[PDB]
Amino acid sequence: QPVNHLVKEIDMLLKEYLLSGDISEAEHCLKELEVPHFHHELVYEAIVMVLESTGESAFKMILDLLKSLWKSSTITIDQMKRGYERIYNEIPDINLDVPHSYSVLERFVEECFQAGIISKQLRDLCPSR
């Protein structure tokens, strides 16, 4: 299949963040991509990475990145909503691939709500509930 160059760049950005811990680098690289109508894909891929990870480090790191991106006006409400809704749609299959993903997703969504970055409506739409 042909390369989706932008998916590749978003995955590289997220992996570089998880490996380096450098939130500012991640933010700057996202802005340099200049893809504000594909920020739903950043959100989607970031949450999939949390679901696929082990231990707590990726969960916290991705939480902190999404917190900063929302709070800095880098992701619009529509893009944020669509990223989470895309995860909510695909979670049955993600959960088959990675058991107990419903519970990880629910914890992640609750922590995002506790951080002020998603509406109560969007939290409540999580199918784990």
mmCIF file of C-alpha atoms in Angstrom:
data_model
loop_
_atom_site.group_PDB
_atom_site.id
_atom_site.type_symbol
_atom_site.label_atom_id
_atom_site.label_comp_id
_atom_site.label_asym_id
_atom_site.label_seq_id
_atom_site.Cartn_x
_atom_site.Cartn_y
_atom_site.Cartn_z
ATOM 1 C CA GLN A 1 0.000 0.000 0.000
ATOM 2 C CA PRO A 2 1.188 3.549 -0.755
ATOM 3 C CA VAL A 3 2.822 5.420 2.072
ATOM 4 C CA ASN A 4 0.619 7.857 3.945
ATOM 5 C CA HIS A 5 3.368 10.345 4.597
ATOM 6 C CA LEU A 6 1.456 12.293 7.180
ATOM 7 C CA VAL A 7 0.482 9.248 9.252
ATOM 8 C CA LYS A 8 4.165 8.334 9.151
ATOM 9 C CA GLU A 9 5.169 11.805 10.368
ATOM 10 C CA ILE A 10 2.623 11.773 13.189
ATOM 11 C CA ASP A 11 3.744 8.320 14.313
ATOM 12 C CA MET A 12 7.401 9.420 14.167
ATOM 13 C CA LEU A 13 6.590 12.523 16.203
ATOM 14 C CA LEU A 14 4.817 10.489 18.878
ATOM 15 C CA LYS A 15 7.520 7.817 19.062
ATOM 16 C CA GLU A 16 10.245 10.476 19.300
ATOM 17 C CA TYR A 17 8.287 12.040 22.157
ATOM 18 C CA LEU A 18 7.927 8.754 24.017
ATOM 19 C CA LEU A 19 11.636 7.975 23.555
ATOM 20 C CA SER A 20 12.969 11.423 24.433
ATOM 21 C CA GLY A 21 10.360 12.727 26.866
ATOM 22 C CA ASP A 22 10.636 16.162 25.191
ATOM 23 C CA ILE A 23 7.147 17.703 25.177
ATOM 24 C CA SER A 24 8.327 20.978 23.690
ATOM 25 C CA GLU A 25 9.949 19.179 20.761
ATOM 26 C CA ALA A 26 6.686 17.313 20.138
ATOM 27 C CA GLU A 27 4.691 20.549 20.204
ATOM 28 C CA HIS A 28 7.066 22.322 17.888
ATOM 29 C CA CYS A 29 7.230 19.461 15.464
ATOM 30 C CA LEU A 30 3.420 19.305 15.317
ATOM 31 C CA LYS A 31 3.255 22.989 14.514
ATOM 32 C CA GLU A 32 5.901 22.550 11.804
ATOM 33 C CA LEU A 33 3.757 19.868 10.209
ATOM 34 C CA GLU A 34 1.055 22.507 9.609
ATOM 35 C CA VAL A 35 -1.848 20.073 9.627
ATOM 36 C CA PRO A 36 -4.547 21.544 11.868
ATOM 37 C CA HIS A 37 -7.330 19.538 10.059
ATOM 38 C CA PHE A 38 -5.560 16.263 10.763
ATOM 39 C CA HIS A 39 -5.058 16.815 14.490
ATOM 40 C CA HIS A 40 -7.756 14.169 15.001
ATOM 41 C CA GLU A 41 -5.149 11.700 13.690
ATOM 42 C CA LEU A 42 -2.586 12.917 16.236
ATOM 43 C CA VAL A 43 -5.139 12.301 18.968
ATOM 44 C CA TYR A 44 -6.143 8.911 17.564
ATOM 45 C CA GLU A 45 -2.600 7.643 17.118
ATOM 46 C CA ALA A 46 -1.558 8.994 20.541
ATOM 47 C CA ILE A 47 -4.366 7.132 22.301
ATOM 48 C CA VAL A 48 -3.688 3.932 20.352
ATOM 49 C CA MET A 49 -0.061 4.198 21.539
ATOM 50 C CA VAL A 50 -1.249 4.404 25.134
ATOM 51 C CA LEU A 51 -3.476 1.359 24.641
ATOM 52 C CA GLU A 52 -0.564 -0.592 23.073
ATOM 53 C CA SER A 53 1.996 0.406 25.734
ATOM 54 C CA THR A 54 3.127 -1.305 28.964
ATOM 55 C CA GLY A 55 3.476 0.286 32.417
ATOM 56 C CA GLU A 56 2.373 3.845 33.143
ATOM 57 C CA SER A 57 4.924 6.008 31.363
ATOM 58 C CA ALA A 58 3.251 6.328 27.942
ATOM 59 C CA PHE A 59 -0.158 6.920 29.576
ATOM 60 C CA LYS A 60 1.163 9.857 31.592
ATOM 61 C CA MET A 61 3.313 11.259 28.790
ATOM 62 C CA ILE A 62 0.448 11.203 26.266
ATOM 63 C CA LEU A 63 -1.949 12.674 28.832
ATOM 64 C CA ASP A 64 0.472 15.538 29.398
ATOM 65 C CA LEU A 65 0.952 16.130 25.655
ATOM 66 C CA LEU A 66 -2.794 16.194 24.908
ATOM 67 C CA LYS A 67 -3.265 18.495 27.927
ATOM 68 C CA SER A 68 -0.758 20.955 26.593
ATOM 69 C CA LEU A 69 -2.050 20.820 23.026
ATOM 70 C CA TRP A 70 -5.633 21.478 24.118
ATOM 71 C CA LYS A 71 -4.738 24.187 26.629
ATOM 72 C CA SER A 72 -2.447 26.004 24.190
ATOM 73 C CA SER A 73 -5.200 26.267 21.527
ATOM 74 C CA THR A 74 -3.324 23.914 19.221
ATOM 75 C CA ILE A 75 -6.178 21.425 18.699
ATOM 76 C CA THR A 76 -9.678 22.688 17.910
ATOM 77 C CA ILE A 77 -12.757 21.320 19.611
ATOM 78 C CA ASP A 78 -13.902 19.580 16.417
ATOM 79 C CA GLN A 79 -10.521 17.889 15.963
ATOM 80 C CA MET A 80 -10.383 16.821 19.586
ATOM 81 C CA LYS A 81 -13.879 15.376 19.464
ATOM 82 C CA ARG A 82 -13.204 13.473 16.250
ATOM 83 C CA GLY A 83 -10.003 11.947 17.593
ATOM 84 C CA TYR A 84 -11.755 10.535 20.656
ATOM 85 C CA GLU A 85 -14.810 9.478 18.646
ATOM 86 C CA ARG A 86 -12.548 7.595 16.240
ATOM 87 C CA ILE A 87 -11.091 5.669 19.189
ATOM 88 C CA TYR A 88 -14.586 5.007 20.558
ATOM 89 C CA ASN A 89 -15.562 3.563 17.177
ATOM 90 C CA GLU A 90 -12.498 1.312 16.831
ATOM 91 C CA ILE A 91 -12.147 0.133 20.447
ATOM 92 C CA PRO A 92 -13.950 -3.215 19.853
ATOM 93 C CA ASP A 93 -11.186 -4.222 17.479
ATOM 94 C CA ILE A 94 -8.377 -2.613 19.446
ATOM 95 C CA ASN A 95 -9.605 -4.551 22.493
ATOM 96 C CA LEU A 96 -9.469 -7.846 20.624
ATOM 97 C CA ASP A 97 -5.868 -7.089 19.647
ATOM 98 C CA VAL A 98 -4.991 -5.816 23.161
ATOM 99 C CA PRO A 99 -7.162 -7.253 25.916
ATOM 100 C CA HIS A 100 -8.369 -4.961 28.695
ATOM 101 C CA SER A 101 -8.170 -1.903 26.457
ATOM 102 C CA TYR A 102 -11.679 -0.873 27.508
ATOM 103 C CA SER A 103 -10.469 -0.376 31.074
ATOM 104 C CA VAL A 104 -7.277 1.455 30.013
ATOM 105 C CA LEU A 105 -9.310 3.669 27.693
ATOM 106 C CA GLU A 106 -11.780 4.463 30.459
ATOM 107 C CA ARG A 107 -8.995 5.441 32.857
ATOM 108 C CA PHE A 108 -7.406 7.598 30.152
ATOM 109 C CA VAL A 109 -10.660 9.311 29.315
ATOM 110 C CA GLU A 110 -11.391 9.967 33.009
ATOM 111 C CA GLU A 111 -7.931 11.504 33.456
ATOM 112 C CA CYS A 112 -8.477 13.691 30.402
ATOM 113 C CA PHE A 113 -11.760 14.876 31.848
ATOM 114 C CA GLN A 114 -10.075 15.522 35.206
ATOM 115 C CA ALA A 115 -7.476 17.604 33.311
ATOM 116 C CA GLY A 116 -10.188 19.859 31.832
ATOM 117 C CA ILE A 117 -9.518 18.937 28.181
ATOM 118 C CA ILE A 118 -12.673 17.095 27.108
ATOM 119 C CA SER A 119 -16.338 17.824 27.689
ATOM 120 C CA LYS A 120 -18.403 15.754 30.053
ATOM 121 C CA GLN A 121 -20.427 14.692 26.987
ATOM 122 C CA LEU A 122 -17.337 13.361 25.280
ATOM 123 C CA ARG A 123 -16.217 11.578 28.408
ATOM 124 C CA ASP A 124 -19.650 10.003 28.800
ATOM 125 C CA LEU A 125 -19.608 8.785 25.177
ATOM 126 C CA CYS A 126 -16.741 6.414 26.020
ATOM 127 C CA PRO A 127 -18.103 2.917 25.365
ATOM 128 C CA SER A 128 -16.321 1.471 28.370
ATOM 129 C CA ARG A 129 -19.008 3.170 30.501
#
